[PDB]
Design a protein around this ligand. Sequence first.
Ligand code: SF4
Ligand code: SF4
Ligand code: SF4
Ligand code: SF4
Ligand code: SF4
Ligand code: FES
Lengths: 196, 127, 127, 102, 756, 120, 166
Amino acid sequence: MRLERVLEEARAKGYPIEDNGLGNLWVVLPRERFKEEMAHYKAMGFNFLADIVGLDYLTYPDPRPERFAVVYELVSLPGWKDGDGSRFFVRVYVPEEDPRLPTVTDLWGSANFLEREVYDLFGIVFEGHPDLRKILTPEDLEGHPLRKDYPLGETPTLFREGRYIIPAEFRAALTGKDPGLTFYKGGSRKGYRSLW
Amino acid sequence: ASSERELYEAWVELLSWMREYAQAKGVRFEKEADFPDFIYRMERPYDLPTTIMTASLSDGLGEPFLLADVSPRHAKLKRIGLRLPRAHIHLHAHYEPGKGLVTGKIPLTKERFFALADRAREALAFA
Amino acid sequence: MVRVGMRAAPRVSLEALKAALGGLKLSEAKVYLITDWQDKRDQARYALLLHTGKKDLLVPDAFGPAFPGGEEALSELVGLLLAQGARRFYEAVVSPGEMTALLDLPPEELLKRVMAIANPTDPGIYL
Amino acid sequence: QITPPPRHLLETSMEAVIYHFKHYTEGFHPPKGEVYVPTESARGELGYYIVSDGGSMPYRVKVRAPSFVNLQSLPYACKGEQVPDMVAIIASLDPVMGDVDR
Amino acid sequence: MVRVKVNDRIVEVPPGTSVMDAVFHAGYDVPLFCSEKHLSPIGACRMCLVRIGLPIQWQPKLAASCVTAVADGMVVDTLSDVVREAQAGMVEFTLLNHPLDCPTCDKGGACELQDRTVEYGLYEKYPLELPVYTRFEFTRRHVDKHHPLSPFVILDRERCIHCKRCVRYFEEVPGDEVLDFIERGVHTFIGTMDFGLPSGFSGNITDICPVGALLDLTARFRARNWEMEETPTTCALCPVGCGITADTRSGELLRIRAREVPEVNEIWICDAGRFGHEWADQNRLKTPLVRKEGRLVEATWEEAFLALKEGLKEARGEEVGLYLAHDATLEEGLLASELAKALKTPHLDFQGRTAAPASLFPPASLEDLLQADFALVLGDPTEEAPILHLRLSEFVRDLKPPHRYNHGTPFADLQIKERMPRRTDKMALFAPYRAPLMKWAAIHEVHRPGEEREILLALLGDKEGSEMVAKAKEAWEKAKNPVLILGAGVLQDTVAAERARLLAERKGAKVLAMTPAANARGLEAMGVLPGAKGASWDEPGALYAYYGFVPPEEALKGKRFVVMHLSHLHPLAERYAHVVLPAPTFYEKRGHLVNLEGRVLPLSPAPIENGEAEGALQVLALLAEALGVRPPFRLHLEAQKALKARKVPEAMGRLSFRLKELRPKERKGAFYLRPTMWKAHQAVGKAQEAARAELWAHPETARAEALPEGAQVAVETPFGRVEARVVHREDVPKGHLYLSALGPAAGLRVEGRVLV
Amino acid sequence: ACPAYAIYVEPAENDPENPVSAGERYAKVYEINMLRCIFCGLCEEACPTGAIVLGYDFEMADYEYSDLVYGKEDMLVDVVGTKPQRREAKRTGKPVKVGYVVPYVRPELEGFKAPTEGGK
Amino acid sequence: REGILFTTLEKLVAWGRSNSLWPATFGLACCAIEMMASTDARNDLARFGSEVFRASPRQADVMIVAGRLSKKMAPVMRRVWEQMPDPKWVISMGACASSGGMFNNYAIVQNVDSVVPVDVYVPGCPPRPEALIYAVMQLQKKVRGQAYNERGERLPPVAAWKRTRG
Ligand code: SF4
Ligand code: SF4
Ligand code: SF4
Ligand code: SF4
Ligand code: SF4
Ligand code: FES
């Protein structure tokens, strides 16, 4: 029930409402309204903060507003005091040159680790955090691994007499921007979805 | 029916003749292609006698003048076929029981095939 | 980032590195001995990339037993780096073609790639 | 587009050979979009936030690691408890560090 | 411009646009077999079908978007169920009789049929019903298989889907009809009565065939399409520098293919560049050698450098030779120049230095060549600058550069109709022999060597030429935008190039100079030319010399110190050279060249087995160390900085450089060094007999001189001793013997003899 | 179909007189890096001629990296044992004893000889 | 004195060390679970001499690298090797440890032999418990001087005996 009220509260102020026909909902809040709105979101009854998922869209085929985008996942547990079960995502775009975003540690302690992880994997600093300390990558590692401008750093596979493989030039798989080995891709290899 | 079996057997027999001619006139013979249902059969069991489906007699320039083919194992309207390239000439043989290998109603014996291949050699072969 | 030494001249590369290293303290430096083919060290060749954080140093492929006087030169080199107080030694395995071009990429990409692919190594394998 | 052709008609049909080859080399290309599904594993809510770009390989796969958010409650759980019990309180939390570090 | 609507999108598009280009420019997609870039669209595969409305006025039958013109305000529907079902049906018809060879097919993953099948086939029929792929449960079409049409090309007549691409190309692009169908119905098949596949541009069909019918024998059964490691680079066999792809896997050379760059070569490569790669990965030098017991020994770089120090200890700086190859980069030339400036030596050169520089003349771009009014050509494009021929074939047919859409070059240019006529009034060609292009040039005269200068003089009007030269002069005087095109024969004879300069300045006209050397104009731009003394690449004037190429046998003889910087091992080095060193080919180098039109081009390095080879930058730097002089270049980045200081534009940028100086030398005329497409160092493997040496003789004078029509005659030239098949030609003048100059020493008139 | 790209397949052209495969192509060099191999079963799944099929031997522990690249003649069904096993059988003189028994071999393993449930 | 310097004594002590292999696991990933399963009541490495399990490294001779070796752990595990008594052996268990495996990336050591001297490699994913027993028997015959490579060479009893630690 509270999700419908979220949608009605957001639509009045001009917030885009994203929806796929699969049962997943997005409400994109600007960064100004982000903090206060999500504070209100906790006040609206969001006990549980599932995820903080950061996204780097450098190599995405279509352009996006900003390079980085951080998505928080808000839920209300059905089995607690008054449990509805309404779960949804909030996306907030973060510039390449402005990896700033207020923490919800004060709101949810759940983001204590989660936000740290995104500072490790992305260059995104979450302002007001108790400790933004590199979690996963070694202390002497330079950079942020999950952003697309950071190499995966593969090593060649080894064989008997000088026969070696460099997997990046061995992949028959394509990416979204990879043109393929023929003049073009259309049809199924431009995006494919069955009509149930 | 079961005539199919002997047909493939007869088909194998046909190949022999071809090879013999290669030694006779000193002309190049080549195995063109083998059965797909024998390459790509992975575990599936295979009872057919030979593995070769298409072969040809090529001249000194390598360009074929005589082609012979047999129908695959699971296809409809099975036959054995002969073709003279560039000459718009097609022959379609069956195997009739008691008679033998016949082109339609007319028997296809060794002598007939030898004459046909010799005519192709004298006429069509460039070098 | 500076480049000293010359390819396939182990003693020249080693003496030039002796001169250029000087009194630089390597307590926080990163030593990248770049090679190919993880297993076979008896014929191995090595480049070197030393990242102090303040400035970097590049030695081309002139070290390893693959060259005359190369094994003793790599032993002297790793002993020198350990003497100057380094603890962090790294080995990157690149394709043969990468060894050549990687020293000709711009400094930022070469350094980022080496740092991303480097494996912690025991200097005992080079001593 | 999602299933390679059955193995028996690989020697009969051309489209089978092309589709078997393509499916096992290139794969299929799902549409551009994001998706996520919840499940209950022995350590909690589990799901993959998959961003696909229309290519053979996913643009990004983010994992909600239930063992990652389950671990923020250790200093609280083992707060004030005994020293030997710190091992039991950790084994009792059931962490699989393949899930946390990831 | 005309407004079109594709299914949700509205696009401005110029009027002559094909519906297919409007779909793709609009961002949609449609199957494509029959049509190809630069080929006349004809509705054959019937794959390009769309829905068209022109008022909602839907057409009765599906429209062929490959041969449809577009009208203002047209609705194009590629997503309707009818279109998708029809496209899947046509795929079914096309794959109906296909040989089931995908896993063992050399085409593998880069097969258009595979991709369009998995794209559009098997429409969504409406359950989770058990689906059937093919309805064809009958006997398939079987024809001749794995037939080598030529030492480079293999033919599988079963894989052909009966498009028109190879025959369309064969009539259109080279103008050499050596392929067409034989029969009709479903029995149709490809064949030829011209067996040698004579055209010098046959290889491109290898790339065009949307199936694996025609495959590259020199790259058959090496690796799979995705497996090959691709190195995009530029070919330095001849100065046109076509964009190529060097596919290598496991340190060796697998295959050469076309890289599209419409500025210089469109999508086309010549057979020499594409199939003539066997020599690179086969047999080449990996260890520096040193002379110890009056013989050659494997050595370290250290010991060679020591011998170098000692040999050049007593060498004065003005007697040293600095001689590079014809394919030397801007980096290397600029460093040799600067190093002979510091170490003051007047004579440095490169292998293909012409007496008259190519920089004299203003370069022209090829698209200008398409828009010119006339082309006065002296020399053989087929042999001196091969892909020029192809561009002349757009030039002679009134074709012009198409528009550049959102999917790149247009898929269906309505500007190219099929079976186009070729004009005999658009160009005038003068060669010492009857070239294939003479067929499309009415104004044509077969002359003898040393006679160009007179044709050019007559075109100026200072004397009176033949009927053909008078027509050429008249059309040149009348033409508003003519092109002058000079081969090597003109560029190597100073007075002829001088009269060309005069003729091309007086009428405002730019020049296409088909140099024997690829980076000749760039090395001139970087300053690789001798000084006053003048020991050039062929002269024995210097006393100490460094060589980056193969000099004439007499140039090594006499010197005190000679060092060659080679890739393969040459007997001239193991008998006259003191220190030999390994170099990577242009295939695996990294640097920049300058096109015969003045455009700079990139060299990326190939994962080929170089050994311990090093670029000549490092060698010249190391060689000046023995001389005291310090080098200004060590790497490619500092070299690029110093280049940008030398005012050389960015890659693909054209460099402006003129030069007013000539260095003439006599030519002792008994034999001719015919310019050859095939290069000597390519005679390995499958080009061994293709890149063979020939001796062209007039039947009368051949008969008088006892040269049989098939004989392997041994010939000794200053440029080496080679055996050569004798060819009787009734267009070769009497008294001369045209020896196939398989190097970048073409266009020279040299002494010599036929040995017995 | 290898997620590690651990299989190297150099192809070559059959000799019609004494061929190796049924078609016009064969595998001149067929290697597997057991230290790269993760034992999926995707390679058996993608083989269209049924050539590559996972077996049953697990006793392939060896001492050297360069000794853990299994070759063609180290994996043909005609071979009996793993590399260290065969090498020990040669330097020992005692035939190979496999450390496993199976109820049967699958049809996909036609030819593979194995101990079957107690039939022997 | 290193188990050497007498024809009978060195064979005796090789016997003793071989059947006295004290495995010290360094459990890293899903390889480690298949090693722990090699202790249950179907297949126990508790017979050959490997019953006791001293977590301390000062007390065990066999070090079994069972799992992917991430770089952040590389020195720590390393020091456990330096802090071991000298007659010590190192086994590399699984694909991620032996080679880079399928995780051919920035994070994982592409051969644990980089930081520690590996005795035996045991492919598999995970290597079957019986395969891990095979590798410990392999190491048993290796320290007996009973192990040869494909090239004909005999392998020395102890790897980590030939290295200049630093
Ligand atoms: S031409 Fe294409 S579809 Fe036909 S066998 Fe070759 S790869 Fe398969
Ligand atoms: S051989 Fe290839 S390019 Fe030529 S018509 Fe057939 S499919 Fe087209
Ligand atoms: S035309 Fe010249 S540059 Fe182009 S591919 Fe041929 S040899 Fe190379
Ligand atoms: S089982 Fe081994 S070789 Fe086969 S696909 Fe998997 S990891 Fe690769
Ligand atoms: S080799 Fe396999 S079982 Fe062992 S740690 Fe790696 S993924 Fe896990
Ligand atoms: S019919 Fe071939 S695409 Fe138009």
